[PDB]
Structures are given as structure tokens and as C-alpha cells.
Amino acid sequence: GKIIGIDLGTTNSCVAIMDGTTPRVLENAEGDRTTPSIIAYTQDGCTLVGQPAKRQAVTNPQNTLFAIKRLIGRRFQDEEVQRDVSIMPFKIIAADNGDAWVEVKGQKMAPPQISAEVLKKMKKTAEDYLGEPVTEAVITVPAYFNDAQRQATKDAGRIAGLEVKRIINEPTAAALAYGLDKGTGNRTIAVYDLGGGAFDISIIEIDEVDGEKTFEVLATNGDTHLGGEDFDSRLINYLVEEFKKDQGIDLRNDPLAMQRLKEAAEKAKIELSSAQQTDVNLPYITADATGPKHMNIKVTRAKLESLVEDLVNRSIEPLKVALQDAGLSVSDIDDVILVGGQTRMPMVQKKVAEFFGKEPRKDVNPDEAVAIGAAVQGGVLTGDVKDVLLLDVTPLSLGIETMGGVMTTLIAKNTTIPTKHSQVFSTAEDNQSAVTIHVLQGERKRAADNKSLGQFNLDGINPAPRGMPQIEVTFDIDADGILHVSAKDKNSGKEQKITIKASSGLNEDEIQKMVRDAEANAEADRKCEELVQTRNQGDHLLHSTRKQVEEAGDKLPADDKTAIESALTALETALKGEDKAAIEAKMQELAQVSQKLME
Numbered sequence: 001g002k003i004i005g006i007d008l009g010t011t012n013s014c015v016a017i018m019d020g021t022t023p024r025v026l027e028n029a030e031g032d033r034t035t036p037s038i039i040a041y042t043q044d045g046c047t048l049v050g051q052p053a054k055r056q057a058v059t060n061p062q063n064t065l066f067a068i069k070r071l072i073g074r075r076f077q078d079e080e081v082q083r084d085v086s087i088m089p090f091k092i093i094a095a096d097n098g099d100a101w102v103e104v105k106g107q108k109m110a111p112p113q114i115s116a117e118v119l120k121k122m123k124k125t126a127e128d129y130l131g132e133p134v135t136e137a138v139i140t141v142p143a144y145f146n147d148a149q150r151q152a153t154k155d156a157g158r159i160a161g162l163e164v165k166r167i168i169n170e171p172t173a174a175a176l177a178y179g180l181d182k183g184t185g186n187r188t189i190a191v192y193d194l195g196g197g198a199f200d201i202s203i204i205e206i207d208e209v210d211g212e213k214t215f216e217v218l219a220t221n222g223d224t225h226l227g228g229e230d231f232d233s234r235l236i237n238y239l240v241e242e243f244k245k246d247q248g249i250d251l252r253n254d255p256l257a258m259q260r261l262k263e264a265a266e267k268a269k270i271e272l273s274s275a276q277q278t279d280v281n282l283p284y285i286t287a288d289a290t291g292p293k294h295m296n297i298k299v300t301r302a303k304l305e306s307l308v309e310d311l312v313n314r315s316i317e318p319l320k321v322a323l324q325d326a327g328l329s330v331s332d333i334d335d336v337i338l339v340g341g342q343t344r345m346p347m348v349q350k351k352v353a354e355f356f357g358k359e360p361r362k363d364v365n366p367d368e369a370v371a372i373g374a375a376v377q378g379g380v381l382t383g384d385v386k387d388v389l390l391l392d393v394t395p396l397s398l399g400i401e402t403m404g405g406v407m408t409t410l411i412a413k414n415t416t417i418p419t420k421h422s423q424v425f426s427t428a429e430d431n432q433s434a435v436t437i438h439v440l441q442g443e444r445k446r447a448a449d450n451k452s453l454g455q456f457n458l459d460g461i462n463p464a465p466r467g468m469p470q471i472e473v474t475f476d477i478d479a480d481g482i483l484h485v486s487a488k489d490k491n492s493g494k495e496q497k498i499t500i501k502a503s504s505g506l507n508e509d510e511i512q513k514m515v516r517d518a519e520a521n522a523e524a525d526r527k528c529e530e531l532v533q534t535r536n537q538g539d540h541l542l543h544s545t546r547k548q549v550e551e552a553g554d555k556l557p558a559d560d561k562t563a564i565e566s567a568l569t570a571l572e573t574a575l576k577g578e579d580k581a582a583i584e585a586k587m588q589e590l591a592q593v594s595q596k597l598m599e
């Protein structure tokens with residue numbers, strides 16, 4: 001009944017609701033306001049999401065998935081995906097359509113299903129707080145996400161059983177959260193979002209013209225594979241090389257050692273944001289027949305800064321590009337808003353302050369603002385939030401491949417959305433049966449250097465001289481940033497059937513199958529939980545009966561006492577197994593014969 005806003009981050013996910021006019025973040029079952037984006041599949045069949053999954057990471061590395069957002073919407077042969085293939089403990093494979101999928105327990109799974117598991121946990125948290133079913137949600141994506149990644153995120157939302165009312169850019173959500181309390185003074189802001197895996201920069205104007213707060217995204221830019229994971233990778237590489245120099249062992253050959261080192265590097269990087277120096281201590285990191293080996297290496301803040309300065313500087317150029325696109329300068333930015341945990345690093349804050357010449361505001365929560373803005377967006381869609389208007393832009397220039405492999409723009413970057421373009425297309429061959437259009441996204445002048453959306457084939461063209469048929473093709477960009485291509489004959493008005501080929505993404509049948517699979521996974525998790533509860537009850541009953549035997553057993557007649565010695569073992573026989581109902585039946589017979597010892 002109530003639309004919830006979900007920040008679906010690479011490392012941490014958050015959920016918020018509109019409690020009347022007040023946005024409110026909800027805490028998960030563990031008590032945390034944010035949920036780590038870690039999904040674990042147990043052999044028992046329990047699906048673990050968040051902190052518990054992280055706890056089991058050391059014991060189930062192959063079936064524990066994380067950083068799935070870095071794979072969503074990407075093809076397997078991408079350089080980033082190929083780099084991640086040799087690093088992630090879980091198996092990354094190519095799908096039948098060439099997209100990057102994961103392999104868990106011998107089953108191929110698309111990243112949308114895995115993200116849908118986290119979305120299901122957030123949905124369950126929202127329902128537990130509200131006590132009513134939730135079927136509608138607003139889901140966040142990085143501003144610089146291309147069409148394929150946005151579509152895959154919407155598919156993940158659908159698989160989780162949520163009607164995705166709106167896909168909202170994370171900097172836009174932060175802008176909504178900030179504009180809720182201080183959007184009234186006609187202020188231009190720069191939202192600098194640096195999360196676990198993605199970086200975005202948005203120049204956004206906020207004005208109170210005639211009593212309605214309007215948020216207009218003047219410009220946007222970023223990098224979808226730049227984030228705290230790369231900082232951790234730099235630190236891990238330094239630590240591995242130093243350990244190999246000190247002890248001669250390359251830890252890259254030990255997956256468990258690499259997992260522990262990833263955890264230690266994450267903790268050290270976080271601690272260096274407050275401390276000037278930390279010590280990475282990983283005792284018993286590995287063991288040879290000579291004995292255990294221990295890692296103990298000092299890391300100063302200067303060392304980490306020297307290791308990640310180039311990444312921080314890589315984040316700076318999109319600021320210049322966005323400022324040029326907006327037609328403004330650093331003096332024309334009234335407020336600087338930092339978003340994301342990685343901005344807590346003092347080097348990032350110093351670099352941003354030096355770039356803009358002014359210190360960023362301290363009144364914005366970097367971990368919760370995105371979910372608050374998503375909840376605000378949901379409230380706007382229902383009318384619960386009034387006097388608020390939004391005008392976002394397309395992050396990438398849409399174009400087509402023309403003669404010579406050159407890119408031909410149809411919709412420029414930073415064009416406000418929703419938007420509609422129409423262009424006339426015709427045949428290049430006599431009596432041509434079909435006309436193909438290669439559609440791509442990117443700013444590069446060469447078609448081969450842009451993200452291909454695919455070949456759209458207008459097929460079934462009646463024979464005619466080349467250039468005679470006149471097909472108007474319309475490219476629509478909805479409020480989600482997703483492209484929809486349509487075609488109609490401008491002479492007759494009849495629609496032309498478009499067949500998409502060589503595109504990335506999931507089809508409808510796959511999505512339905514994955515929804516059913518998600519339901520099956522939920523039922524398997526409940527069965528595993530019921531079994532766990534049954535084992536706890538059985539152990540409690542066994543201990544209680546032993547206590548009763550110790551206190552009163554000797555007074556009890558020998559016949560029942562001697563019989564129950566093995567009768568309790570009969571209950572144990574089922575208790576050691578994977579039986580839920582028979583454990584209860586044996587528990588019932590044991591309790592009925594222990595009744596005399598109960599009272």
C-alpha cells in the first residue's frame with residue numbers, strides 16, 4: 001500500500017518510507033539501519049542476506065556473492081568483468097546471450113536474481129515494520145548507468161515481487177533529501193557521490209519559483225566502475241606483495257587467505273580515515289610444515305593516499321566535464337554535497353574542497369540520504385509529497401552507427417527526460433526486405449568505442465525502390481532512463497514490427513522463470529528455518545529431561561528410566577538427521593513417556 005524507497009548499493013543497501021510527510025529509515029532484523037549487499041546460499045537451502053551472510057563467507061566462499069552491482073547490465077567479455085573473473089571467489093560465467101552471469105551450486109543465475117534477493121530482504125523489512133504487504137517500490141541506480149544496467153535493475157525489482165514505480169538516480173535522491181530542508185533559496189549544488197563501486201557527479205539547481213520546489217539536473221557525469229572496491233584492491237595488492245617479499249608465499253593462490261586479507265584491508269582503510277597509522281595483523285594467515293605464518297604490516301595514511309591518489313584524481317575529471325556541460329564554473333556552485341561512505345576519506349574531502357574552493361556541507365548523511373530521496377520520490381508519485389517537481393537528464397548520448405563506423409547522435413547527453421525523438425528511415429537496397437539500425441550509447445565518435453544497445457531490424461518491408469518507403473522511428477526515454485524504440489509507416493500510419501538482435505538483457509520468459517525460482521528459494525529458506533527451530537526445541541527438551549532425571553530420576557521407577565535411556569536416543573536418531581516432522585513425532589512420544597518426570 002505504501003511505496004518504499006530502496007537504495008541498492010554495491011556494498012550497503014538501505015530502505016526508507018514516508019511516515020506521513022516525514023521520511024523515515026527502517027532498521028533490519030539485525031538492528032542495523034543499512035544492510036550489506038551480500039547474498040549466501042547454504043547447502044541446507046537457507047538464503048542468507050546481509051550481515052549473517054558475511055559471517056558465513058569464510059566457510060562458503062564459492063556460494064557467497066557480493067558486488068553483484070558491478071556485474072549487473074554488463075557483458076561477459078567486458079574488460080572489467082574479465083578482470084573480476086579471476087578475483088571473485090564465486091564463479092562468473094557467460095550466459096547464452098553473452099551477458100555476465102554467476103554460477104551457484106551448478107545453477108546459472110543472472111545478477112538480477114541475486115540483487116532481487118537483497119531487494120526481497122528490504123521488502124521483508126519494510127513489511128515487518130508496516131505490518132502490511134508492500135508491492136510497490138522506488139529503486140536507485142547510479143546516475144551514469146547505461147540503458148542495459150537500468151533495465152537489469154528494473155528486472156531485479158520485478159523478480160523481488162516489487163512493482164518498480166520509478167528508477168531514480170542516486171545523486172537525485174540525495175538532492176531530494178537535501179532540498180527537503182534547504183531547497184528554498186535558489187541554490188545550485190554539486191552532488192559528489194563516491195560509493196563502494198560507482199562514482200557520480202551531478203550539478204543540480206533547486207528553486208522555489210512560485211511556491212513549488214523544482215529540482216533540475218543541470219549536468220551529470222561519472223564512472224560506473226570506480227569505487228571503494230578499487231581502493232581495497234590497491235591496498236590488497238600492496239599487502240600481498242609485501243607479504244611475498246617478507247615470507248616468499250604468494251597469497252593469491254589461497255582463496256581463504258585472500259578473503260581474510262580483503263576483510264583486513266577494508267578495516268585498515270576505514271581506520272585510516274580517523275587514525276594517522278594502523279597495523280594490519282592477520283595471525284595464522286597461512287601455515288607450512290615449518291609452522292604458521294603471520295602478517296603484521298604497518299600502513300600509514302600517507303601510504304594509502306599514495307596508493308589511491310590516481311583513483312581520487314580520476315574522479316576529478318568528471319567534475320570538469322559536468323561543469324562544462326552545465327555552462328558554469330566553481331564559483332557558480334552554491335552548495336557541495338558529498339554522498340557515499342568512500343567520501344569519508346580525508347583525501348577525498350580535501351580534493352573536492354580544493355577543486356570547488358569551498359568546504360562541503362556537513363548536514364547530509366552520506367549513507368542514508370539516497371534512501372530518503374527514493375522515499376521522497378515515491379511520495380511524489382502518490383501525492384503524499386506535494387509542491388515538489390523533478391527534471392532529470394539522460395546521462396549518455398544516444399546514437400546510431402552510420403556509414404564508415406562513425407557515431408551519429410540522435411539524443412545528446414544531459415537532455416532532460418522523459419523525452420521523444422523521431423527520425424525518418426528508408427531502405428538502402430532495392431526491394432529491401434528489412435532495414436537494420438545499430439543503436440548505441442556513448443560519447444565516443446567511433447561506434448566500436450560505445451556501449452551497443454543492439455541491432456533493431458524493421459522486417460517485413462514490402463518490395464519497393466530503394467529510398468521509397470518512409471518509416472518514422474521514435475526513440476522514447478522514459479523517467480527511468482530506459483530507451484523504448486517504436487516504428488510506424490508515416491504514410492499509412494501502420495506500426496512496423498521491430499526485432500531486436502545482439503542486445504543485452506533478459507526476456508520476459510526468463511523473468512517469469514526467475515520470479516518463480518525466487519518464490520521457490522523463499523520457501524526453501526522457510527523450511528531451513530523451521531528445521532533450525534525444531535533442532536533448538538529438541539535440544540532444549542533433551543537438556544530439560546536430563547535435568548529432571550538428575551533431580552528426580554532416581555525416585556522414578558526403573559522400568560521407564562531404563563527404557564527412556566535408549567528412547568531419548570531414538571529421538572536423537574531423528575535429531576541428527578534432516579527430518580522435521582519425525583523429529584516432532586519422536587519428541588511427542590519422548591515427552592509423553594517423560595510426562596511422569598515432568599510433574
Ligand SMILES: Nc1ncnc2c1ncn2[C@@H]1O[C@H](COP(=O)(O)OP(=O)(O)OP(=O)(O)O)[C@@H](O)[C@H]1O
Nearest residue numbers: 009010011012195196197198228273340341342344
Ligand atoms: N570511514 C570510511 N573511510 C573510508 N572508506 C569508507 C569509510 N566508510 C565507508 N567506506 C567505504 O565506502 C564504501 C561503502 O560506501 P557505500 O555504502 O555508500 O557504498 P554503496 O552505496 O554500497 O556503493 P555504491 O553507491 O557505489 O553502489 C566501502 O568500500 C567502504 O569500505
Ligand SMILES: [Mg+2]
Nearest residue numbers: 009195196340
Ligand atoms: Mg551508494
